[PDB]
Amino acid sequence: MDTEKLMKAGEIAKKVREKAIKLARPGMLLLELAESIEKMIMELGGKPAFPVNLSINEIAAHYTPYKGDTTVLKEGDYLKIDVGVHIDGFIADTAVTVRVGMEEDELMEAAKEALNAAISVARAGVEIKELGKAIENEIRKRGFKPIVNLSGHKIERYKLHAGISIPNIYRPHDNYVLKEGDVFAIEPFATIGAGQVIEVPPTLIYMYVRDVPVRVAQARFLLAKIKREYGTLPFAYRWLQNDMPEGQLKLALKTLEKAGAIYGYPVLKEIRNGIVAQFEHTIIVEKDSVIVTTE
Amino acid sequence: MDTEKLMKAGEIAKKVREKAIKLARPGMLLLELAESIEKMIMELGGKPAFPVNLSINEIAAHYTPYKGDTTVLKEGDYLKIDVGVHIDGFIADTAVTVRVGMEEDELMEAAKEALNAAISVARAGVEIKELGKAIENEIRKRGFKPIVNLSGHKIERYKLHAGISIPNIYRPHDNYVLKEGDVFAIEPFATIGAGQVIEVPPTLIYMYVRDVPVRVAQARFLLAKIKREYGTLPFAYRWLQNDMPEGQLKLALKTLEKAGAIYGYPVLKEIRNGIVAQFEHTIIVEKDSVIVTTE
Ligand SMILES: [Co+2]
Ligand SMILES: [Co+2]
Ligand SMILES: [Co+2]
Ligand SMILES: [Co+2]
């Protein structure tokens, strides 16, 4: 629909991103950080597509603070900020790696540079694999491993990950064809570890999924609120940490989870605890070139 | 449409597959082999979906003989046989690894076992990732690496690789949902190498793609032949070696290649030249279980 909305989300996400890079100074508490970003996005004119992700070093992604996290930045950390905005369901998913209180290095360069290459070739008509390979070369020609299980994704109205991915590697059969009006989030992750990530507890981000009559009353209602307040967008436990006792909240979520009403999206950590750089922009696949909502 | 056709394709491919395993005896010339299989498929009632693939050891796949290959099997080889049949476009892609003149081992077991698991969970409703994970565990718990760039694919009428894949790894965002009536080819590849494949020349298989006003004369006729007899389905170079002398043939292809008419699918070889075992069956995603065309 309104390409302007995909643009607005993109525009907000840009500004907020920029500012986050700034608040990203040593000792800065992750929790303050997130809150600021979310409310900014808010007062700026839009709701978040998903809770800001502030992932540090080996924590690949899927990490968001919660009312209680004492964690603060530390000089030399590889902080990764992945933000997403949405105007009525039109997402903008951008992200950047900041070496806390320091300047970028070869790793960070590899991810950024990679990401860039992908854009230069995206244009209606090309097969996904081309971006894939592009990304792979930049990362590997710099001696770095690209992650093989975290990757770009195609966005759709009120659907963050709509089905088609954009690997950071070259898989010879990825032959989906970038159509016109296509909206894609390109996001190469680079690492010095093995190049793969595993899920490790706790589960901070969750996803609403399906109506499933639950017996335990409270749970059911917790869900109902969920339905109506977040929708199809993934949300944070931190976002509900005050709508009921920390204790009783848990179960409700679990029961909801053990019921398949909502899916939990645990923290993603590089297998051999390798540093993880990352940059992501969102694009709209046009005929001869792509427009970057988050430029 | 006719589930019976998907069944028929499936049925032929089964028989043929079975027989190939037998013809797979030492010193057996790969070229005799392929010919047999293809003609059997033929006389059995159907056309091949793609040229039989006889891939040996570190040759992951995409290898097919050509009029000229002197290559003969050798005791101890890990021959991989990937066959595909199609009834009016309803494919059946099945495949197996045979230790030439020997009995299967841990590797081969891993890939097989892996494949099985995937089926056990396939059923309308699950997310692709579940299968992915499944595969990953069987292959890895046996200390073997799964290939990360070769993987299962969703089949559709006259479209071998229709877009959605089924990774041999767990990528947390593979959330496509197995619908009812879905046809998928699950195919785990296992290897002791690194777990990745690269393209290496030559280019034996090719695939039509789009009508391009070409300048050279014979290519143009070659184009319209490819168009009429092969179609959207991929072909082997071995299938056209009669239609014209070596030299002229090549060029008509090459022009077309450049023309953007037919894409060529080079050989796939495991990077650290590691052994590659593989098994593949095609399924139809039904409500509570899946029907395996190639059982
Ligand atoms: Co993102
Ligand atoms: Co993203
Ligand atoms: Co196959
Ligand atoms: Co296949």
Swiss-Prot record, chains A, B:
Biological processes per GO annotation: proteolysis
Class of this enzyme: hydrolase
Entry EC no(s): 3.4.11.18
Keywords: Aminopeptidase, Hydrolase, Metal-binding, Protease
One Gene Ontology MF term: initiator methionyl aminopeptidase activity
GO cellular component: cytoplasm
Entry note: cofactor: Binds 2 divalent metal cations per subunit. Has a high-affinity and a low affinity metal-binding site. The true nature of the physiological cofactor is under debate. The enzyme is active with cobalt, zinc, manganese or divalent iron ions. Most likely, methionine aminopeptidases function as mononuclear Fe(2+)-metalloproteases under physiological conditions, and the catalytically relevant metal-binding site has been assigned to the histidine-containing high-affinity site.
Record field: catalytic activity: Release of N-terminal amino acids, preferentially methionine, from peptides and arylamides
Binding site for substrate: 62, 161
Function according to Swiss-Prot or TrEMBL: Removes the N-terminal methionine from nascent proteins. The N-terminal methionine is often cleaved when the second residue in the primary sequence is small and uncharged (Met-Ala-, Cys, Gly, Pro, Ser, Thr, or Val).
The protein's assembly and partners: Monomer.
Protein's UniProt name: Methionine aminopeptidase
Originating species: Pyrococcus furiosus (strain ATCC 43587 / DSM 3638 / JCM 8422 / Vc1)
Gene: map
